[PDB]
RNA sequence: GGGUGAAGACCGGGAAGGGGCGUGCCCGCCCGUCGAACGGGGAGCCGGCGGAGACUCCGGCAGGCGCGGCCCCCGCGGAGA
RNA sequence: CGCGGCCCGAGGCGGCGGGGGCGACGGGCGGAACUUAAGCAUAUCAGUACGCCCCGGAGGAGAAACCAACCGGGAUUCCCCG
């Protein structure tokens with residue numbers, strides 16, 4: 001016989017999902033929204049994620065151990081030599097916005113699937129006006145995993161150690177090559193015919 | 198009728214058990230003036246509606 | 248896929264496991280054997296029943312059924328029972344006709360309980 | 364400044380980007396039920412401005428309502444009294460569509476406390492609102508001095524007594540001074556006070 | 567006439583159970599005597615006493631059982647609803663006194679630097 | 689599931705809508721132990737007894753439907769009907 | 770062709786809540802006609818009767834996008850006065 005799968009009546013939730021994907025595909029999307037449909041390549045994303053994994057904040061299990069150990073040690077004394085100043089990345093739209101406007105961030109990563117999208121729809125133009133490099137990336141889950149959260153809207157680099165400088169400079173050059181602002185701001189999306197492809 | 202539910206039968210049962218006079222020793226124990234029970238009924242005159 | 252219909256999947260189902268009991272103390276009801284039986288009925292027709300058919304007439308709680316009347320009679324009066332017929336009277340009581348087993352003399356049990 | 368940027372952005376509803384996003388959202392809502400729970404607010408900044416917090420006990424629901432005027436409920440469209448009470452189809456509701464959404468949600472979820480609501484979309488036959496609700500018996504709610512006040516028994520069914528912002532506006536309580544002196548503490552109370560016959564002992 | 571709960575509280579559960587069984591048995595016997603023959607004064611006198619005796623024994627048994635069960639859940643988080651404190655519905659669903667007195671930290675600070683003082687005028 | 693109406697309420701197929709054997713697998717779009725002491729429906733006759741009951745009691749003789757033990761078998765005849 | 774994250778949904782389990790009642794007072798809606806005008810249609814009766822929903826020991830209101838025009842006052846409520 002023949003395959004019956006393409007003829008199944010799926011539950012309403014699944015149908016809504018798929019129709020929404022189709023509609024976004026074949027409508028005329030304005031260029032400001034369209035830039036979030038064209039992320040950065042995968043190779044550069046992997047390089048950046050490795051470098052950023054080297055600068056992750058505290059771990060959840062380390063946090064749990066600290067909550068007892070350092071908590072009860074701060075009572076003993078010597079409190080200052082208890083919170084090390086290890087360099088870490090920063091997350092959160094409020095903090096990111098604060099340090100982009102003051103020019104303390106060298107690289108900003110923005111997730112491509114933020115809902116609602118007005119939360120970060122303006123960030124690329126602010127970064128461009130402030131002379132700060134930025135890159136759109138693939139998923140909120142990955143950015144969250146970088147900082148041990150479920151998801152996040154964006155992270156940013158504020159400082160790096162001298163050893164890691166050459167790799168950071170290579171990443172910066174590749175990003176500046178792969179991200180163009182005027183072209184992105186002039187290009188429409190969508191408008192794909194069903195029968196055509 | 199002869200084909201009744203138990204629920205109707207139980208409500209008619211209570212009506213019959215209650216159709217009684219005031220006992221003689223009660224009348225004199227309580228020093229009663231009115232010696233008749235005016236909540237009695239007679240089948241030929243009443244409509245129980247039960 | 249041999250069926251064109253989408254069905255809800257199968258998921259694990261658990262059992263009830265309350266944190267505290269809903270009825271901490273076990274309580275009795277109306278169905279105790281001695282309170283289930285009320286009293287025997289005494290009339291000439293009934294003494295004739297005892298003599299002729301090996302049968303005793305008793306008043307019981309309306310909520311009792313034949314099997315439990317049989318069990319209660321067997322336990323409270325140590326004897327054997329053959330069959331039970333029941334009846335609800337016009338005044339609302341339940342009447343039982345209890346016929347004893349052939350190798351049992353109903354008259355001696357009746358006298359022992361004081362009915363005779 | 365992120366929320367400042369969001370606010371200025373939401374002041375431009377007729378831009379191409381927001382027009383496209385609104386079209387997508389209105390298509391999405393048209394395929395769902397008239398009352399629905401949301402995982403999180405659709406507009407974080409407006410929700411924060413109205414009092415929402417990101418902790419256990421705060422919930423959000425989306426509500427849909429129909430647009431236009433009202434029609435009277437009389438058989439065959441016949442009013443029988445005097446000629447001035449004869450109209451059927453040209454009337455307007457005394458309360459706004461924003462205040463009707465809170466009543467619908469409160470009726471559907473009688474065990475929660477309504478807080479506020481805000482606009483999220485419209486399409487020419489419907490409007491959509493979001494309602495913030497509080498669970499009054501969650502410990503995080505009961506032990507927080509900033510929201511404790513809603514655990515009192517007088518906060519029961521606030522929307523049924525016209526005590527939310529939209530109900531207060533329909534009652535005329537957004538005004539003070541000349542023009543508003545016959546409606547506090549309520550219309551009927553003022554009418555009763557102005558028509559009482561006082562008969563003192565030494566008249 | 568009849569038993570006293572005083573010396574009844576001094577028996578074990580099995581003894582009380584057997585006592586109750588005998589009381590019910592002889593109550594049935596007295597009911598039979600009333601139904602048949604005639605009500606002589608002595609058996610009718612014993613009848614009321616036996617009824618109240620059954621009542622008293624049941625009271626004692628239930629009190630003992632309740633005390634044991636209550637001791638079983640003395641320190642648990644969730645206890646059977648029959649042992650929780652006696653209140654009304656409305657006062658059960660109410661904020662405690664310290665929850666009503668809670669204030670935000672800023673108001674706490676303000677209300678400590680300006681405490682109430684005693685003074686007289688003239 | 690829902691839809692509508694200020695409500696009370698009224699209207700309603702388009703909705704991830706159950707079982708089995710026995711633990712893993714297999715089958716499966718979607719209500720009602722509501723509504724007929726005249727419709728459908730597994731099976732009762734005779735004789736006798738009381739003061740008031742009987743197709744119901746007692747005596748006799750049968751039917752139907754289940755459960756438990758012991759023995760206990762997987763088809764031949766006719767030319768054809 | 771399989772499996773991890775996020776997102777959006779489904780079934781079950783545990784612990785906590787809701788529902789109904791109350792000829793007054795209170796809040797929110799829907800809303801008459803008799804009657805007066807010596808007739809009657811705007812007006813009046815009346816923002817009443819009555820219907821529906823919702824709390825409490827009270828409720829509601831409440832710390833100015835207020836009055837005023839003065840050699841000014843100063844959140845709300847209630848009484849006296851016109």
Ligand SMILES: [K+]
Pocket residue numbers: 724
């Ligand atoms: K029938």
Ligand SMILES: [K+]
Pocket residue numbers: 815816
């Ligand atoms: K009026």
Ligand SMILES: [Mg+2]
Pocket residue numbers: 275276277
């Ligand atoms: Mg009992």
Ligand SMILES: [Mg+2]
Pocket residue numbers: none
């Ligand atoms: Mg208020």
Ligand SMILES: [Mg+2]
Pocket residue numbers: 722
């Ligand atoms: Mg039927």
Ligand SMILES: [Mg+2]
Pocket residue numbers: none
């Ligand atoms: Mg028939």
Ligand SMILES: [Mg+2]
Pocket residue numbers: none
């Ligand atoms: Mg027979």
Ligand SMILES: [Mg+2]
Pocket residue numbers: none
């Ligand atoms: Mg007859």
Ligand SMILES: [Mg+2]
Pocket residue numbers: none
């Ligand atoms: Mg549950």
Ligand SMILES: [Mg+2]
Pocket residue numbers: 804
């Ligand atoms: Mg009048």
Ligand SMILES: [Mg+2]
Pocket residue numbers: 806
């Ligand atoms: Mg007139």
Ligand SMILES: [Mg+2]
Pocket residue numbers: 807
């Ligand atoms: Mg006249």
Ligand SMILES: [Mg+2]
Pocket residue numbers: none
């Ligand atoms: Mg006239």
Ligand SMILES: [Mg+2]
Pocket residue numbers: none
């Ligand atoms: Mg008027």
Ligand SMILES: [Mg+2]
Pocket residue numbers: none
């Ligand atoms: Mg108040």
Ligand code: NA
Pocket residue numbers: none
């Ligand atoms: Na209610």
